Design a protein around this ligand. Sequence first.
Ligand SMILES: CCCCCCCCO[C@@H]1O[C@H](CO)[C@@H](O)[C@H](O)[C@H]1O
Ligand SMILES: CCCCCCCCO[C@@H]1O[C@H](CO)[C@@H](O)[C@H](O)[C@H]1O
Ligand SMILES: CCCCCCCCO[C@@H]1O[C@H](CO)[C@@H](O)[C@H](O)[C@H]1O
Ligand SMILES: CCCCCCCCO[C@@H]1O[C@H](CO)[C@@H](O)[C@H](O)[C@H]1O
Ligand SMILES: CCCCCCCCO[C@@H]1O[C@H](CO)[C@@H](O)[C@H](O)[C@H]1O
Ligand SMILES: CCCCCCCCO[C@@H]1O[C@H](CO)[C@@H](O)[C@H](O)[C@H]1O
Ligand SMILES: CCCCCCCCO[C@@H]1O[C@H](CO)[C@@H](O)[C@H](O)[C@H]1O
Ligand SMILES: CCCCCCCCO[C@@H]1O[C@H](CO)[C@@H](O)[C@H](O)[C@H]1O
Ligand SMILES: CCCCCCCCO[C@@H]1O[C@H](CO)[C@@H](O)[C@H](O)[C@H]1O
Ligand SMILES: CCCCCCCCO[C@@H]1O[C@H](CO)[C@@H](O)[C@H](O)[C@H]1O
Ligand SMILES: CCCCCCCCO[C@@H]1O[C@H](CO)[C@@H](O)[C@H](O)[C@H]1O
Ligand SMILES: CCCCCCCCO[C@@H]1O[C@H](CO)[C@@H](O)[C@H](O)[C@H]1O
Lengths: 229, 229, 229, 229
Amino acid sequence: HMFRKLAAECFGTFWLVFGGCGSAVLAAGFPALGIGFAGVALAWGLTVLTMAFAVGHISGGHFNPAVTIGLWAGGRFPAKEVVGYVIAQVVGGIVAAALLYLIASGKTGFDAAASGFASNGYGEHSPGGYSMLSALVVELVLSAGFLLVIHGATDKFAPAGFAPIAIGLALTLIHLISIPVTNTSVNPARSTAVAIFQGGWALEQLWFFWVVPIVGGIIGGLIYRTLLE
Amino acid sequence: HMFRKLAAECFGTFWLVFGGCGSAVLAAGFPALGIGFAGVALAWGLTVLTMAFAVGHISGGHFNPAVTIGLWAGGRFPAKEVVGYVIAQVVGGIVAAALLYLIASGKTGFDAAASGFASNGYGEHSPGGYSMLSALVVELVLSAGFLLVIHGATDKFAPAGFAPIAIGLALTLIHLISIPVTNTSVNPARSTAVAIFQGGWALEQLWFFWVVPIVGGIIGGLIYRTLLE
Amino acid sequence: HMFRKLAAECFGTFWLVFGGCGSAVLAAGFPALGIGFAGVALAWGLTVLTMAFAVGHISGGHFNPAVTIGLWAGGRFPAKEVVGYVIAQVVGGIVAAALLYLIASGKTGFDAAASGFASNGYGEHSPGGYSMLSALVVELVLSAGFLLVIHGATDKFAPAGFAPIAIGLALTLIHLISIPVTNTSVNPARSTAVAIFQGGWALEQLWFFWVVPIVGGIIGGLIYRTLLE
Amino acid sequence: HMFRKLAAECFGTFWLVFGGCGSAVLAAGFPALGIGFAGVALAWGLTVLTMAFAVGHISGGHFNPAVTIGLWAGGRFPAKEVVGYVIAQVVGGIVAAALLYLIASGKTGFDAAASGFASNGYGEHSPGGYSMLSALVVELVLSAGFLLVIHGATDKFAPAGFAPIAIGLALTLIHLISIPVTNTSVNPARSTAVAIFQGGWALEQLWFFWVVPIVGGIIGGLIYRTLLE
Ligand SMILES: CCCCCCCCO[C@@H]1O[C@H](CO)[C@@H](O)[C@H](O)[C@H]1O
Ligand SMILES: CCCCCCCCO[C@@H]1O[C@H](CO)[C@@H](O)[C@H](O)[C@H]1O
Ligand SMILES: CCCCCCCCO[C@@H]1O[C@H](CO)[C@@H](O)[C@H](O)[C@H]1O
Ligand SMILES: CCCCCCCCO[C@@H]1O[C@H](CO)[C@@H](O)[C@H](O)[C@H]1O
Ligand SMILES: CCCCCCCCO[C@@H]1O[C@H](CO)[C@@H](O)[C@H](O)[C@H]1O
Ligand SMILES: CCCCCCCCO[C@@H]1O[C@H](CO)[C@@H](O)[C@H](O)[C@H]1O
Ligand SMILES: CCCCCCCCO[C@@H]1O[C@H](CO)[C@@H](O)[C@H](O)[C@H]1O
Ligand SMILES: CCCCCCCCO[C@@H]1O[C@H](CO)[C@@H](O)[C@H](O)[C@H]1O
Ligand SMILES: CCCCCCCCO[C@@H]1O[C@H](CO)[C@@H](O)[C@H](O)[C@H]1O
Ligand SMILES: CCCCCCCCO[C@@H]1O[C@H](CO)[C@@H](O)[C@H](O)[C@H]1O
Ligand SMILES: CCCCCCCCO[C@@H]1O[C@H](CO)[C@@H](O)[C@H](O)[C@H]1O
Ligand SMILES: CCCCCCCCO[C@@H]1O[C@H](CO)[C@@H](O)[C@H](O)[C@H]1O
């Protein structure tokens, strides 16, 4: 049933934004004991590992408009189901961002706009001061690579069952490399969710984190489909 | 035999409290080399991963009254076995908390009451100063999500064998997000165990960490059963 | 062939001491970027995960005299092969400790005696100042629990293939809890290897880390065999 | 088809250098939140875990001239395919190093030569001041051990599917031990890639990190083939 797959994609994407962004906003910078980028990166991949095992057998477990569209371009997913996944994914992420904003507001001094609310940005809004070109190349390469890993790990001849470990851990890796550059998107639903609550520059740069992750995912699906499969 | 399943749940829950709380009390804040929240979060999920692989095939490996009751509500576990699991779980956790208190007392300056002995709390007793509403929402969402992941990872059509990785790592993730908010419960046996030895406010707020994790687990079982399965 | 199993146990135990102790001596305290106890704990479990997958199908992959003897007591391993495993394990660990001492000496200021060379100790020689009773209880409980996890993860009805993940990660967990107490033994071959090169108090307390890990392993094998299996 | 296997080895090795070196150059030392050696070590192993699951079923997933040649020496891979793998691997790594250098240049003050651009070195160029002998022994032992783990984890009687976890995590472990000594090579393609852009001493010491990782891999393949298999 399409409706359960959509529900799976919705809950899945909530889990991803709530855990990934949640761990950044609530836990990364906690004084002395905070989890850092490494811990945020771990949380990211675990959201996908845990939900891909929980609901992958229902929707395919994309939880990411760049995954859905890259699987489309890779010949693994039908055109007709794409938009519904992307919508489910966005809604899921917004609901998680909203519950997170509520949780974060329960601590004195919380300020979504000034902290950035874990939004992805480049230039002045890159966590490490990286240029827009730096942001483009990193997001493109890692979106491509994420898709190449998803395609291959779910290949016919790939050992059955492990895809959720491969894919989720691939997202940890992605974050271990790129947080300093863009705060790591590779996911338009993820960038949209928190940008809405950040409410300023995150909305002005949001288009970047629709365009680049998607193109990158497309490229990754094409590489697998035409050169590897 | 019910007796071995109870024993499995008892040893399992001891392993969870001893490792999870043990790593927090003995190792989180160790000067210069201590493991932080990220390391506590890792320990948490590994207690469940390791025991779910060790004794999951005996009891189902709940190790958590919110898991048992959420599996009940999800239609995966019988009413008649619930109370015995919960009792086993509580006893297991108390024995671990007691052996831990003994281990911790062997270091000059240990003080269960003043340190909090890894107890879950909100408000004044949240590690990060988060309100009661912040604590409710986080514990509710993550208890629900823990149950959704348990249900899905053990679904008929979920690949056999991986559930312990999915579930245990889901608990790491849960801790990576919420330690700052409540010290992370999602488990009434876990909160009760150490609150007894903390012996003050942890006992006054303990009811919260029975009610919220259970309701949350219930909701998660209901979501899976009615919308996903 | 017994000879290959011994060789597997020997190489295995070298891998464990070289990686576990190696990461502590070379990397834990590296200024600013060092890996801490959490990273040492991760290295520990990965030595066992990686070798249990590499040579578990040859020897059973014990790499630990407390594992061999606890599997004996659990009815999973024959008396007649025990001593040969323990010998293989000790030799393996000593060779790793020797190559490590050589590697560590290649940096100005290295001093095995004064640093402790990653040796296990209690009292004055506990990393965190914990008493002998604290050391006994922690080592006993965690040795028992390690054995309970090994027995269960390799149970007939335990899903085939995952034991190396369960067991190796159980050792990470063990280290996440107890490094501050004893530097974490649960392994007489591991304690002997480096105590020889530390060459002072580590040799005076070594008996503790033969007796306690073994008794603990025995207890864990007995718990599984009589109450769980 | 040889061409796809080469492409798999090429993309694979790019993924390894881009993630491993990428995480070091972009994220290790990030102020306050940076990922450290432990996080770099995790990234390393995840590059191999993720690509071995994605393309292992295509090429065998070596991503490392020391792996290819050690599998040769172990009797697991034909002489005639070796050079093509090594070439693919080197090209892959250089392309990743180039895209990384471009990403890193987008931040004020980046200087590949002075930072070392994550190059492997010994002596004056060891991160921790370790001698050349220290560097030889560590790289030899860990290259050998990496190969022993690869051989065993892919043995006939090794449980099917887990090799990518065993091998990838073995690389994390390798890095947890040796970064301080050499920045961890065990991979000539990895050392060559960044040495080209470092452009000074990294090129003068590069031969070391061809010779030692290869000899070590050879030894590891020989140990398995003659003593364990
Ligand atoms: C699915 C929801 C996507 C939301 C995209 C909306 C883009 C908003 O656009 C932004 O609006 C803000 C006005 O409040 C301003 O801060 C910015 O100048 C403007 O670019
Ligand atoms: C699927 C639902 C969301 C679709 C993509 C949202 C793209 C938002 O794009 C944003 O639009 C603004 C225009 O108002 C511009 O001012 C911003 O610069 C741009 O980031
Ligand atoms: C899917 C979301 C829209 C993607 C359209 C691709 C081209 C967008 O192009 C960009 O739009 C920005 C404002 O939106 C401007 O600030 C940039 O100058 C413009 O280059
Ligand atoms: C299964 C065991 C559950 C124990 C729940 C008992 C609740 C105790 O209640 C508490 O008792 C303390 C008196 O010692 C006081 O600190 C508190 O004011 C009181 O709320
Ligand atoms: C299964 C065994 C334990 C059941 C749940 C214990 C709930 C304890 O609840 C506690 O009770 C006290 C009443 O004395 C109150 O004062 C505290 O505020 C409350 O946290
Ligand atoms: C299972 C444990 C009891 C849960 C009962 C749900 C309602 C409890 O309600 C709460 O009890 C606390 C004291 O116990 C009071 O401090 C709070 O004001 C009260 O709201
Ligand atoms: C398998 C190898 C086990 C070695 C155990 C030997 C116990 C050594 O015993 C120790 O010897 C040292 C003398 O050099 C002294 O530092 C100590 O006082 C003494 O207890
Ligand atoms: C299997 C090979 C090693 C067997 C166990 C070694 C036990 C060493 O035991 C050591 O012996 C010394 C006696 O000289 C005592 O002085 C020390 O206190 C004690 O730690
Ligand atoms: C297997 C290694 C020997 C274990 C024997 C168990 C009893 C050892 O007993 C201990 O031996 C130590 C010196 O060895 C003394 O310092 C202690 O006082 C003594 O209690
Ligand atoms: C596959 C590509 C391998 C490149 C190996 C080339 C070895 C370069 O050699 C180096 O060249 C530099 C001149 O630019 C100098 O810094 C060094 O003195 C010299 O050793
Ligand atoms: C497969 C393509 C690369 C082959 C190995 C490159 C080995 C480079 O070796 C380098 O060569 C230089 C000679 O110019 C010496 O000066 C350096 O000391 C040495 O590191
Ligand atoms: C595959 C790359 C070449 C390996 C050849 C093995 C012997 C190299 O030998 C070394 O070469 C270096 C310059 O290249 C010199 O600095 C050293 O003194 C020399 O020992």
